[PDB]
Amino acid sequence: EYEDGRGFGIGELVWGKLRGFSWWPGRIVSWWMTGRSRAAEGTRWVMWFGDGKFSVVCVEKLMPLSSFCSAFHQATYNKQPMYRKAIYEVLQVASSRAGKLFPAVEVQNKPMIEWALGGFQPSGPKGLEPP
């Protein structure tokens, strides 16, 4: 599965872009997790954080989580509680992988967002990879 040389393999935390919606946090899953069928070449199944919906997304509309500064939209964050939830979730998962520890969603998000914005120090983007 996904051996087409386009990257974004299973378990990778990503930003995904559908028409009519902001870049949204998700993770790449296998097709059998979706309760659907195989994705076409050059596309991936992503499970969105926030509500856990599944979508087929072309790799051209995917960015790694590390592209946080380009994808993160402050206006969306302010107005959409599910976006704050999605940010919370993807960064909880990311920080667990990187071994980045932090000392209700809006509160806990701030150090995690700062971490993301600062280049995911000390691990960098490498710490965000599936174990």
Residue numbers in the entry: 9 to 111, 124 to 151
From the study:
The PWWP domain comprises 100–130 amine acids and is often present in chromatin-associated proteins. Our structures revealed that the overall fold of the PWWP domain consists of three motifs: a canonical β-barrel core, an insertion motif between the second and third β-strands and a C-terminal α-helix bundle. Taken together, similar to other members in the ‘Royal family’, PWWP domain also exhibits methyllysine histone binding ability.
DNMT3A and DNMT3B are DNA methyltransferase, which are essential for de novo methylation and mammalian development. The PWWP domains of the DNA methyltransfearses DNMT3A and DNMT3B are essential for targeting DNA methylation to heterochromatin regions through their chromatin binding ability. DNMT3A had been shown to bind histone H3K36me3, but we were not able to obtain its cocrystals with H3K36me3, Nevertheless, we found a bis-tris buffer molecule in both the DNMT3A and DNMT3B structures. The bis-tris molecule resides in the conserved aromatic cage of the PWWP domains. Superposition of the DNMT3A and DNMT3B with the BRPF1 and HDGF2 complex structures shows that the bis-tris molecule is bound in the position occupied by the tri-methyl ammonium group of the methyllysine. The bis-tris molecule is bound to DNMT3A and DNMT3B in slightly different conformations. In the DNMT3A structure, the bis-tris molecule forms two hydrogen bonds with the D333 residue from DNMT3A, and three hydrogen bonds with residues G298, L300 and S304 through a conserved water molecule. The bis-tris molecule in complex with the PWWP domain of DNMT3A or DNMT3B provides a clue for designing small molecules targeting their histone binding domain.
